């Protein structure tokens, strides 16, 4: 009921079921990440035959619709901004790489552009190993104090999860020059996350 013809794979997708305006750039992934998760459940359980066969056409239309919309927010240097002509956000750039790495095969995307995207995220890693955003889309960590500790750790963990999904894009061309840099960047950030997790006092999120 959640991922079927009456759910995430409806002709209008979950975007019409969530019932909120989706003008912002991050909201474009509501056409992508839920549709991808709905396809993963039906693929691994071999349940496409139960639904009407036109659902697969609905799925690829939603993913291509999201890819076509989100690419309008792409900056020249491979980063993504919350709005058009707005400053680039490290968090949103990570979210795009985490989702578009899975969807690029079926939408006709370019692996070269995603390799350019991950290189920009690597340039935002600080000396400690944490990542930094000059204008994050989400703040969240409020009411509970020590906001800088939670934000930097949550952002770093979110970028690493995005960079790991980006490893699936690489082939033989980027196996030596770029893939080794990303794996080292993930290991450098995991050292930051490891000491902060061992030190404790992190928020629940």
């Amino acid at each position: 009921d959640t991922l079927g013809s009456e759910g995430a794979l409806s002709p209008g997708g979950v975007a019409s079921l969530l019932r909120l305006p989706r003008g912002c750039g991050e909201q474009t992934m509501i056409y992508l990440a839920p549709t991808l998760a709905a396809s993963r459940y039906l693929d691994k359980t071999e349940q496409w035959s139960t639904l009407p066969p036109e659902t697969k056409d609905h799925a690829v239309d939603l993913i291509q619709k999201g890819y076509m919309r989100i690419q309008q927010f792409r900056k020249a240097d491979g980063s993504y901004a919350a709005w058009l002509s707005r400053d680039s956000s490290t968090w949103l750039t990570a979210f795009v790489l985490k989702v578009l790495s899975l969807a690029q095969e079926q939408v006709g995307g370019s692996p070269e552009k995603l390799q350019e995207t991950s290189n920009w995220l690597l340039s935002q890693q600080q000396a400690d190993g944490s990542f930094q955003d000059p204008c994050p889309v989400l703040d969240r960590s409020m009411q509970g104090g020590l906001v800088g500790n939670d934000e930097t750790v949550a952002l770093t963990a979110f970028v690493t999860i995005a960079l790991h999904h980006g490893l699936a894009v690489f082939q033989d061309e980027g196996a030596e020059p770029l893939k080794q840099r990303v794996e080292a960047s993930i290991s450098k950030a995991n050292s930051f996350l490891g000491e902060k997790a061992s030190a404790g006092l992190l928020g629940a999120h």
């Binding site: 076509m68 690419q71 309008q72 058009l84 006709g108 995307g109």
Partner: protein, 651 residues
């Protein structure tokens, strides 16, 4: 003394047949030679690219026009697709006669050619030229081969936005040779020009593209017209025309708008820069929804001096008129602009592109010009006079003053006789009255010690229709040779389409039958041999406006004014069973003020078919070796070589 001639188009397109011309001269009376010609990799171990076409040449059939297939799969096996330094391949002819009688050190003879993956013809069009973010856009692409017949090969179609990023990429193999696709522009899109590009999947550089503008929503409440009194401004020392315009504002149903019109004047550069006159902005009230604005010659010169310019400083700029009409009852306003008010030196313009710019000493030089009236191309009945300064070596230069009246589509062809002892020719062309359009050209004579020249004379220089017979005169000039035949060939769309010989007479005439294969323009190349030296010259013939094979006719019988909703019946008639792709476009988006990206016509189709033409000139003739290069060919006789193009372009 005996030799084998090999010419071929300068660039071979992979996947489509390459027409190869082979000819031999000065052979014994009963000689018969045989061999093979094929493409081979100039790198590696010089692996031949599979297909070999054999030739058998006799003294009674000394020429052969061959078709080399050159398939894609064997081009990859040859290793050309991998590349190294440049995209070049060599076409080589193998015959024992090279070692058997010419005694050339190698049994192989060939020349280097560039290669390209471009093949076929791809036409693509959108359902509208101008869209708004949020609108769906339908586009269709047509696939045709070299012979303008439907092609079923797989294509890859891609759409990029204003910033050049792909938003869609699809691969489709298409029977019936028409592919249609829909998509919706996201509403947050930045305004600009998007581009759709379609190419054959195997042809990496076979791309054809159409582009459209996506812009923000704007619909005027009432129509606004800016109408100049004269559609151009004449600037001549001591004279300046009236410079007057009318401004009209009315609602669509007809009632005139009651309001005030604010008009401002400036200069519009050809790059796009706008420079306003700060003191000459004017405000006038509309009467009957209209207003008449006049800018005096005194005010205009005062305006130019305000920004430190003179009347002489005008250089093809446009007088810019920007009008804002504000309604009096409502207060809302609409704007309009006039960007087509050029400063011109004459009501006519001269096109001198068809001039050879290469002299043939001792033979008439044809001055070819086209006179346009800016509003339209054909300026017929206009007197055009040429002043020809013939610079002789040593003696005083002599002047020829010839004139003729343009006719037909505004063309003119003025013979200018030049002696055999000439250093350079300087031409001064003056067309139109009272204010003439001028064009000045200087041509240098070929080297004086040349081994003779060939003159190709054309009696009536009017473009022939498809089906007419054109007669061309071959006239050798200079020292004179002992040759037995003239050799001529026809080049159309970058391929050798015809080749033949013509015997040497006191007056030799070649009759060419122009059919559909030769449209829209073809090169006529002719040559003879004088003591192991080729002597050649070429002439480009433009074919008159052609028509389809068969026909497609659309007709709505009777009066074509219809009301809303009621049915209308359209008649479609065609020569065979065919796929008829239709489309209805509003006349507003195609109006004068809009840079509309005009739709397809037969002119666009013929121009697209001519994209494979390799001719980088109007005829050439300075040197017999490079007159084949100026026609688009690469050629070698075993003694001299063509240099081969640096790039698929005309430097």
């Amino acid at each position: 003394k005996p030799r084998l001639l090999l010419f071929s188009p300068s660039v071979v397109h992979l996947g489509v047949p390459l027409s190869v011309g082979v000819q031999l001269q000065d052979v014994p009376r009963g000689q018969v030679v045989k061999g093979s010609v094929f493409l081979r990799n100039p790198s590696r171990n010089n692996v031949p690219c599979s297909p070999k076409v054999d030739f058998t040449l006799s003294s009674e059939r000394d020429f052969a026009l061959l078709s080399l297939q050159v398939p894609l799969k064997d081009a990859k096996s040859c290793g050309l697709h991998q590349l190294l330094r440049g995209p070049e391949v060599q076409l080589v002819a193998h015959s024992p006669w090279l070692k058997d009688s010419l005694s050339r050190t190698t049994n192989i003879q060939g020349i280097n050619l560039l290669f390209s993956s471009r093949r076929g013809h791809l036409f693509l069009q959108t359902d509208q030229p101008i869209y708004n973010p949020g609108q769906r856009v339908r586009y269709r692409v047509f696939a045709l081969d070299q012979k303008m017949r439907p092609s079923t090969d797989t294509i890859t179609v891609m759409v990029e936005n204003s910033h050049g990023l792909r938003v869609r990429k699809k691969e489709v193999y298409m029977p019936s040779s028409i592919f249609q696709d829909d998509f919706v522009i996201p509403d947050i899109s930045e305004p600009g020009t998007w581009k759709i590009s379609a190419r054959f999947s195997d042809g990496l550089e076979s791309n054809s593209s159409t582009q459209f503008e996506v812009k923000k929503y704007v619909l005027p409440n009432f129509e606004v017209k800016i109408t100049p009194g004269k559609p151009y401004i004449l600037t001549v020392p001591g004279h300046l025309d009236e410079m007057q315009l009318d401004i009209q504002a009315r609602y669509i149903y007809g009632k005139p708008v009651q309001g005030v019109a604010y008009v401002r004047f400036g200069l519009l550069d050809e790059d796009g820069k706008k420079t306003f006159f700060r003191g000459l902005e004017s405000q006038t009230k509309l009467v009957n929804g209209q207003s008449h604005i006049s800018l005096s010659k005194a005010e205009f010169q005062d305006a130019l001096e305000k920004l430190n310019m003179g009347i002489t400083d005008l250089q093809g700029l446009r007088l810019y008129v920007a009008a804002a009409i504000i309604e009096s009852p409502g207060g809302e306003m609409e704007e309009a602009e006039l960007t087509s008010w050029y400063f011109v030196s004459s009501p006519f313009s001269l096109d001198l592109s068809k001039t050879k710019r290469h002299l043939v000493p001792g033979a008439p030089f044809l001055l070819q010009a086209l006179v346009r009236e800016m509003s339209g191309s054909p300026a017929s009945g206009i007197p055009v006079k040429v002043s020809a300064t013939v610079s002789s070596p040593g003696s005083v230069p002599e002047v020829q003053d010839i004139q003729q009246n343009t006719d037909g589509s505004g063309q003119v062809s003025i013979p200018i006789i030049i002696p055999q002892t000439i250093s350079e020719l300087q031409l001064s062309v003056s067309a139109g009255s009272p204010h003439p359009a001028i064009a000045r050209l200087t041509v240098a004579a070929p080297p004086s010690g040349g081994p003779g020249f060939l003159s190709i004379e054309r009696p009536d220089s009017r473009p022939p229709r498809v089906g007419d017979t054109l007669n061309l005169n071959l006239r050798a000039v200079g020292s004179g040779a002992t040759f037995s035949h003239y050799y001529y060939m026809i080049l159309s769309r970058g391929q050798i389409v015809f080749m033949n010989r013509e015997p040497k007479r006191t007056l030799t005439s070649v009759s060419v039958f122009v059919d559909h294969h030769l449209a829209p323009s073809f090169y006529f190349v002719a040559f003879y041999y004088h003591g192991d030296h080729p002597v050649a010259n070429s002439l480009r013939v433009d074919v008159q406006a052609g028509a389809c094979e068969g026909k497609l006719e659309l007709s709505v019988d009777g009066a074509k004014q219809y009301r809303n909703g009621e049915s209308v019946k359209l008649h479609l008639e065609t020569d065979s069973l065919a796929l008829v792709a239709l489309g209805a476009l509003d006349t507003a988006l195609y109006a004068a003020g809009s840079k509309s990206h005009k739709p397809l016509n037969m002119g666009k189709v013929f121009e697209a078919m001519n994209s494979y033409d390799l001719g980088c000139g109007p005829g050439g003739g300075d040197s017999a070796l490079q007159v084949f290069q100026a026609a688009g060919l690469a050629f070698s006789d075993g003694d001299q070589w063509t240099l081969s193009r640096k790039r698929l372009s005309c430097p």
